[model samples]
Target: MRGSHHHHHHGSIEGRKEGYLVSKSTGCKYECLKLGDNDYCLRECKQQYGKSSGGYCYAFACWCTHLYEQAVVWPLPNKTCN
Candidate 1:
């Protein structure tokens, strides 16, 4: 984790948010698993209920969602996924 410039109570720190979402898959690293050459991953890049399982996660960076085409998913992991 990184430190913050923001302070609380004159000389205190208010850290980041604490929350997470899971793959809703049988395995932890579910994103790697493709469905007949199709990637149907929907995991986000936050803590999976505050636990790490070594997987690909996408954070809401705005850049991730930013895209030229609305029909296709943004911040694609691959050109095919796009």
Candidate 2:
């Protein structure tokens, strides 16, 4: 990709999105959550904050590690997904 630029400012940055970990109100068990549930937080965050969503291990708390804030988790975090 070559765009002839006679004047370059500093750097044309193209990079990945950013978000942060927003811990759920409750916790989650690894086996308790299904495989698809793993990405559940990811997708939800993408919409909720309109950015990125990540790092959900179903640990003591379902963590969404994108460049974001606040926490209002749903479905799996409450420990009763039935």
Candidate 3:
């Protein structure tokens, strides 16, 4: 026999936009978290930090350091994305 599943989207206090991150070592699931806003600009990140945003991510690595202190990795090959 086979079974099916159903999903629901009854919105609530779940203002969090969720997503996942992959591991650099294995290139697989690293962690799950609420997706950050689309503020990829240095100014945008800093706005969240009140000083320096430091880094940003647009999918790969998935992070917004200013919003989530410990939430990202190097965005390039020996390069910085701040």
Candidate 4:
């Protein structure tokens, strides 16, 4: 997760609410995975969640969602359940 300068802080000691709000405005980096044709190999790239995933090459790119956009956060290795 990345931080943004859009949020305003009072003095000190806020809480999770402040943190979540800040994060909501901030952008994040995530790796997008695509299955290659025929070979069944996966291709990945470091992409800015709110922006385009790399470029026109990655036509069916994905993005993060929690930010209210097409951005979809990449699942962490140990964060997945069977």
Model number with the top TM-score? 2
> Model 4: residues >4 Å from true position, as ranges?
1-35, 38-70, 78-82
TM-score of 2: 0.35
What TM-score quantifies how close candidate 1 is to the native fold?
0.15
* Position 10, candidate 4: lDDT: 45
Q: What are the TM-scores, per candidate, against the unseen true structure?
A: 0.15, 0.35, 0.23, 0.16
Can you give the lDDT of residue 9 in candidate 1? 39
lDDT of each: 0.28, 0.46, 0.38, 0.28
Candidate 4 lDDT, tens digit per residue, 12-39? 5433210011123444332235522221
* Alpha-carbon shift of residue 39 in model 1 (angstroms): 3.5
* lDDT at residue 38 of model 1 (Cα atoms): 29
List, residue by residue over 1-82, the lDDT tens digit for candidate 2: 9988696234455333343333344333233275345666566556666564565545454445544224333344444533
lDDT by residue for model 3 over 1-82, one digit each (tens)? 7877785445454433322222244443321243454334344345433454344444443443433323223434423333
RMSD of each: 13.7, 10.5, 14.0, 13.1
Candidate ranking under TM-score, highest first, comes to 2, 3, 4, 1
